[PDB]
Amino acid sequence: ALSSVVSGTRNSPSFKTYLRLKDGKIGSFFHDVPLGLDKQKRIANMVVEIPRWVNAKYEISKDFKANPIVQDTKKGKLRYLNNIYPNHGVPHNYGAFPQTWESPLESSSLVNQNILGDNDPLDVIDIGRFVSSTGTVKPVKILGSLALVDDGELDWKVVVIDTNDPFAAELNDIKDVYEKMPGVLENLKRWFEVYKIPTGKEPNSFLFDGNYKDTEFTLKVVQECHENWYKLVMGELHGDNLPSTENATLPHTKGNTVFDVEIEVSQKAEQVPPEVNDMSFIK
């Protein structure tokens, strides 16, 4: 089975999580984890970036070799998400669909409006009961989606649940969450609207009037972004500033390679800065 390995020191700029492939070789979280999309069973594989109730802004890096998960930084400073009261850190496990990409050139057939893709793998929110570690790859059941608009880009949020959650069989479309998990859709919607306000940013807004899109519509977003990724790795797109497509597993692709990376020994994990625990109370 796929697994992961930590490099460097937790809560320092050296921290990384790499994908380990089945033979022990290093792969890319972006390119080498099969999405494993099953349109019939409405399941696909998520890469977990941020465990529920964690603040560190871990993401799959498009820049570092082999696309490890690294903590975001600004002005050289590690970035922590705020506590949007009464949330502690992220309210659910946050991650991505591997082998997907929101092209900032191919404008979506699914929105009537000429709006940009956000240039990253599709964002995934796992609302299940399990707290999942950074670098976990697991099957999730696709439920619905939220069309967040952040800085002119369509930042889709796809709501899923871990297929190991006994409750997953009780949820077969996005209205099931509203009825059976009271408060989850409302809280995620408000979180994504306001989470940058404490950093000096304006509230985000929504397409579709702020309404969640159902499973059938969401599956089309996933398929489209999986096809965009496909075109990207096959060299079948013309465009500047395309992500790296270096990969360990995709035969005949230009980026196909063997990854040679240094796994740095982990030191005494640094303290999180105490100000990370401050709460943000948003009107």
Next chain:
Amino acid sequence: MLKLSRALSSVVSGTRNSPSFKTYLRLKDGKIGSFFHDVPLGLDKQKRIANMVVEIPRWVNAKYEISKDFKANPIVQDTKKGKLRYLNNIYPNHGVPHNYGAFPQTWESPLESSSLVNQNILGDNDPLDVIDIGRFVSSTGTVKPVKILGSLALVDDGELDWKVVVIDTNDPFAAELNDIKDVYEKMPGVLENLKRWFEVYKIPTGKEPNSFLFDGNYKDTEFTLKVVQECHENWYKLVMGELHGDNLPSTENATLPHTKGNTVFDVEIEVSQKAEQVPPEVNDMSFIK
């Protein structure tokens, strides 16, 4: 780093996330005291401050409390049928939303009805509950000054369970809060969340929701000081042996020179092993309509 003056502190006994875990009060000379009896409440009516004993740090689930039954009144995790008790995650809260604790040298008498409520309703037999809404996360067994802001008259299993809202006096925002309305206006969602939390938090354990006096309104600072005074007065009668009842708390104490319970504690500090794992079900979320 280095304190030139003696201060109260605490000592952990046993293993975290195990039935052995205990935090004891250490008095200025290093001996063991009671968190219930031996921490001066320090109530200052004019500055609207008093000392809190912190039981549960913000975003912790473990239901730590001052034990009325254990010798020297350590803070211990509530346990039932030999099973450690954890508070639920009342979505979207993670554990307790703020630092939770108590006012030492206070007690809600279960004998008397308060003269401050227009209603016959008995107290909950424990120190007054305190909720510190400040930015700092405080460790179990911390004693610190807090500014009293207001209170909520929760009713739980028929008993009046006062919740006192306070802020750590070191919080730079403390100066901007002078009464319970400043929290409502300047810390949007805090009072709302606490009130809903106290209404629903035992529903996952199979209890009906709690109710309130004063129609679920918060009481202001002036009224709250009267509740704290009255509970401090009743604590005093308890330790002075002036009350009759079959299940009064123990009044054993190290520091109160004129009390029957005044004693020297001899407690064992057990070696701490590596903290046990919290059971993974403690991370499940409760979604209450």
